[PDB]
Amino acid sequence: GKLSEQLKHCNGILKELLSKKHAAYAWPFYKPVDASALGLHDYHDIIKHPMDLSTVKRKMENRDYRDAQEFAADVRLMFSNCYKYNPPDHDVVAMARKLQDVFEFRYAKMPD
């Protein structure tokens, strides 16, 4: 159906975001932010709903997402967390912006 087809487009986007093509700026988003490892002892006080591409991949594989909108909400939550926690001129924010550009332009090519 339409939902299955739209979720296949989402899975295609997810595969691209995890691909070597985008690795130079995607890598901070591959796994959950390790707040303790990075010394970010305020991270989980500021970010109430952590999200990352490994979590999106697990949710896609487990058929957690019922539609494209639900998938997109998690990918955008991941970027929003980065923009909320970090100063806007930090390298990780520049990398978030670049990966979100990849995401938004391909998400816009969703089949109707």
Ligand X SMILES: CC(=O)Nc1c(F)cc(C(=O)N[C@H]2CC[C@H](O)CC2)cc1O[C@@H](C)c1ccccc1
Alpha-carbon distance of 95 to 65, in angstroms, equals 26
56 binds ligand X, rule: CB under 6 A = no
25 binds ligand X, rule: CB under 6 A = no
Q: At its nearest, how many Å lie between ligand X and the CB of residue 19?
A: 18
State which residue has the least CB distance to ligand X: 92
Give the residue with the Cβ less far from ligand X, 21 or 90: 90
Q: At its nearest, how many Å lie between ligand X and the CB of residue 82?
A: 4
For residue 94, is it left (φ>0), alpha (ψ between -120 and 50) or beta? alpha
